[PDB]
Structures are given as structure tokens and as C-alpha cells.
Amino acid sequence: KDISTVLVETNSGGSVFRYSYCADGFVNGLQCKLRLFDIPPGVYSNSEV
């Protein structure tokens, strides 16, 4: 129906192997904010709506 803005990991050959759509949940929203997939604990500033 509409656009998506998914995060993409990629292995040594340039091939994608993990992903996470940004609108599936809430935690992957800030995964799409700061380009890190399994984000460590901490305060993360300035996440928009």
C-alpha cells in the first residue's frame, strides 16, 4: 500500500541477511533511528513522532 523505511544488515559479501521494518513495533522504531540492530541499554535522545 505505502512506503517503508526498513533497516538492513549486510554480511561480508554485501548480501542482506537481517532486517526490521520500522512500523512493526516500537523498539524497531529506534532501531531505525540509530542504525544499530541489537541496541545496548542506555538513554537515547531526540526520537521523533
Partner: protein, 49 residues
């Protein structure tokens, strides 16, 4: 100065207090900018460009 070989040293007869207020700038508000949403708003046609 350290005194020797006696001389006509002048000494003060009375002092006065002097307040010398001295401003040293030490803080500024920490910022968390987001250039993706500053330079262009909710328009997606910026963010792919």
C-alpha cells in the same frame, strides 16, 4: 621584596576591601539535533535526496 641593607621602604598605612567579581562562562545547554528532520520536514522527497 626581601629587605636587606636598610633603606627607606614605604609601607602602607591602611588597606581597603575591593570586590573583583569575575564571571567565567562554564555551561551551555547540551543539544541533540536531528538534521534529517531539521533540513527537511515530514516530506520524504528530501530524505531520499
Amino acid at each position: 621584596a626581601p629587605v636587606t641593607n636598610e633603606r627607606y621602604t614605604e609601607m602602607p598605612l591602611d588597606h581597603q576591601l575591593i570586590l573583583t567579581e569575575q564571571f567565567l562562562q562554564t555551561t551551555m545547554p547540551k543539544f541533540s539535533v536531528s538534521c534529517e528532520t531539521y533540513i527537511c520536514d515530514v516530506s520524504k522527497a528530501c530524505k531520499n535526496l
